[PDB]
């Protein structure tokens, strides 16, 4: 079935989403600097800054989604004392851009979920010993899972700590990708069992 | 490699390298008022233009006491495209400010967008002939600089001298020769303007000629007394 | 009430000094904002707003293809052949939604996205294709990439719509003259509108691809003739060597048109002088294709 | 045309186009605003001559902006056909550019008339 191709496709998409959405957030932030550059330091949260750019289309009081509670008032009292210029159709297309920032960050969030889900399905020992981020990027790191198993513990590399733990944690994560490679039905318990051997050595660290 | 040197005033600097340069620390990374260059020595530094800014010309010409200081707040008039006000703000840093005045309509958006990025520059687009048209915005400046093109630069600087001058504060006035006489030799006009400028409580300390930077400019250093 | 004057110099100075005690960068920065509204209102209403729109637009074409290779390569485990028959990315992002599975393939017809030649081709691609079934967990973000690329194309339409309208706003005659995407790229290699308006006609030619220009300047070679003005909507409308000289003619009239747009305070904003130019450029083109370099015997 | 910043009189325009009439005859002269922006870039322009009644007149207005940048003198002459005939061209010319050489025959004939235009600012 037991496939590993979709995990590499999801990771290969996720890296370009992480090069796309923050880039388009800087683009929208450059646009909104000619309307309100002051809110971007108070609201640096690039999804929710592109929600508050999407929210108050013109200036500013009596706000609901500005808090959902100090950043709401800090944006209202700053938007009263306006500094930039002002037009409308440019502002509308720019708000459509911020909407695409919002939808693309949402698609990245939904990519994260099905990524960790196909992780938890096919490679649960890779997601219990480390976590779905390093584990899902690992099957891109070898290019595929069958090229993880033929790699050694030394030949694979991860991130006094570097010389010891990046070798022994690599040992158990390689052995995790072994029982993920050749099993038909892999388990989530023995991923934590092979995590616990790193846990004794790391309490020794 | 690159030698970075304190100029005769604080804030200003000098690059000694393949070529000598007058240089000045940059407040913001990576932006230009008029397209000028920059150099990292790491600390940022920006070359001033004596040929474009008469302040930098009196800075390179040899002048004793320019009152633009890193602690102090300084007024400016005649900000032609804001060629000097980023230089005044970068020579005062954040503790000092420049309050700039420019009445000509065409190049003032660059001063506005310059005050948009560097906080020490404050702009004035109100009229300087009646200086109480911008009475609400500035209060009690330390020292002034002037670059307007009116003939009564002595009297219009007097009409700002009776408003914004800190008492026992200094004053530099950058005087062009063309607006007033334009046929007779410049020193007989500069003595005339010194006679007129002693009439409004500035007793001059120095006169200085921009010979290789302008054709017959001057700056007059004095200290305004007994009013403000 | 009466108003008193001719003596308010010292009193105005004194309450100005007291306002400094009322205090200093915050009040003077509210005054900075006062000047910011009162001056930006005064001298206009820019070059800078349109110049990142073209950078975003050129990123969009690259981003569509580099997500589109992902869109095929994620779907070749269901349909290898559907990558090869339809090649456009928006048809692929539509055809994940439209075809569905190979059982939903033969049932679902394709009048909207590639019909009447490629309907037979996708019905022959559905019957034999060496890929697999793909599950309902798999059709969560395969199924969502198909509408993400659609929305990327729709946002590209918003990019082109805003560029096309604001071209008529800022440069009404040059974008009535040469085309609007060159109308972005010319200011993009320029910077300001004035930076191109201070550029002569021979620099409107070789604005983009200036390497062979420099290979012509320092090595004894010959310059390009077309340059960035090649991809404009009128240079390719000739044929052959005739496309060379027209690269001057538009770049000539561009200088007549851009400076009509960048340097006119009273302005119809209506594209006439650019169309007055384009009529003569088309007339030079129509006189140019009229000539033939062959032998015409009697 | 209210954008006529300095348009010379009948008198100084005659000497200006006299320096034009001789300046083509030494081939000391480039013709055209498109070539004027090149001569100003490479700086060998003595001064830049502009016509006033061409439609539209905005197609050369970048050159007073340029001649303030490089600090080169300039004037407005009234008519393009005069400028072309004094340049030796059969065509109308909106703008002429006198090339610089210290050894050409009309050189002081440049400088005294150039100092005429340099008076006008």
From Swiss-Prot, chain B:
Q: Give the record's family classification.
A: Belongs to the methyltransferase superfamily. Fibrillarin family.
Q: Which UniProt keywords apply?
A: Isopeptide bond, Methylation, Methyltransferase, Nucleus, Ribonucleoprotein, Ribosome biogenesis, RNA-binding, rRNA processing, S-adenosyl-L-methionine, Transferase, Ubl conjugation
The organism's taxonomic lineage, starting at the top: Eukaryota, Fungi, Dikarya, Ascomycota, Saccharomycotina
Cross-link Glycyl lysine isopeptide (Lys-Gly) (interchain with G-Cter in ubiquitin) residue location(s): 54
Q: Would you tell me the Gene Ontology cellular component terms?
A: 90S preribosome; box C/D methylation guide snoRNP complex; nucleolus; nucleoplasm; small-subunit processome
Post-translational modification remark: Methylated by HMT1, forming asymmetric dimethylarginines (DMA) within a domain referred to as an RGG box, made up of repeated Gly-Gly dipeptides interspersed with Arg and aromatic residues.
Q: Where is this region: Helical?
A: 185-217
| Major enzyme class | transferase
Assembly with partners or alone: Component of box C/D small nucleolar ribonucleoprotein (snoRNP) particles that contain SNU13, NOP1, SIK1/NOP56 and NOP58, plus a guide RNA. Interacts with snoRNA U3. Interacts with MPP10, NOP58, SIK1 and SOF1. Component of the ribosomal small subunit (SSU) processome composed of at least 40 protein subunits and snoRNA U3.
Q: Which GO terms describe its molecular function?
A: histone H2AQ104 methyltransferase activity; O-methyltransferase activity; RNA binding; rRNA methyltransferase activity
Where this protein primarily resides, as one coarse class? Answer: nucleus
Question: Impact of mutating residue 19 to G?
Answer: In nop1.3; thermosensitive allele showing a decrease in histone-glutamine N-methyltransferase activity upon shift to restrictive temperature
Enzyme nomenclature, EC number: 2.1.1.-
Task: Tell which residues of the whole protein are contained here.
Answer: 85 to 324 of 327
Name of the protein this chain belongs to: rRNA 2'-O-methyltransferase fibrillarin
Q: Name one GO biological process term.
A: box C/D sno(s)RNA 3'-end processing
The free-text function statement in the UniProt record for this protein reads: S-adenosyl-L-methionine-dependent methyltransferase that has the ability to methylate both RNAs and proteins. Involved in pre-rRNA processing by catalyzing the site-specific 2'-hydroxyl methylation of ribose moieties in pre-ribosomal RNA. Site specificity is provided by a guide RNA that base pairs with the substrate. Methylation occurs at a characteristic distance from the sequence involved in base pairing with the guide RNA. Involved in the biogenesis of the 18S rRNA.
- State the reactions this protein catalyses: L-glutaminyl-[histone H2A] + S-adenosyl-L-methionine = N(5)-methyl-L-glutaminyl-[histone H2A] + S-adenosyl-L-homocysteine + H(+); a ribonucleotide in rRNA + S-adenosyl-L-methionine = a 2'-O-methylribonucleotide in rRNA + S-adenosyl-L-homocysteine + H(+)
Subcellular localization, as worded in the UniProt entry? Nucleus, Nucleolus
Q: Where is this region: S-adenosyl-L-methionine binding?
A: 83-84, 102-103, 127-128, 147-150
Curated annotation (Swiss-Prot), chain D:
Keywords associated with the record: mRNA processing, mRNA splicing, Nucleus, Ribonucleoprotein, Ribosome biogenesis, RNA-binding, rRNA processing, Spliceosome
User: What GO CC terms are in its UniProt record?
Assistant: box C/D methylation guide snoRNP complex; nucleolus; nucleoplasm; nucleus; precatalytic spliceosome; small-subunit processome; spliceosomal complex; U4 snRNP
Q: Which InterPro entries match?
A: eL8/uL1-like, H/ACA_rnp_Nhp2-like, Ribosomal_eL30-like_sf, Ribosomal_eL8-like_CS, Ribosomal_eL8/eL30/eS12/Gad45, Ribosomal_eL8/Nhp2
Q: Which Pfam families match?
A: Ribosomal_L7Ae (PF01248)
GO function term, MF aspect, one: U4 snRNA binding
Compartment(s) where it occurs, according to its Swiss-Prot or TrEMBL record: Nucleus, Nucleolus
Q: Report if keyword Nucleus is assigned.
A: yes
Relate the outcome reported for changing residue 77 to L.
Impairs binding to U4 snRNA, but not U3 snoRNA, and causes pre rRNA processing defects and an accumulation of unspliced U3 snoRNA
Similarity-based family: Belongs to the eukaryotic ribosomal protein eL8 family.
What does this chain do?
Common component of the spliceosome and rRNA processing machinery. In association with the spliceosomal U4/U6.U5 tri-snRNP particle, required for splicing of pre-mRNA. In association with box C/D snoRNPs, required for processing of pre-ribosomal RNA (rRNA) and site-specific 2'-O-methylation of substrate RNAs. Essential for the accumulation and stability of U4 snRNA, U6 snRNA, and box C/D snoRNAs.
Q: What is this protein called?
A: 13 kDa ribonucleoprotein-associated protein
Q: Which organism is this entry from?
A: Saccharomyces cerevisiae (strain ATCC 204508 / S288c)
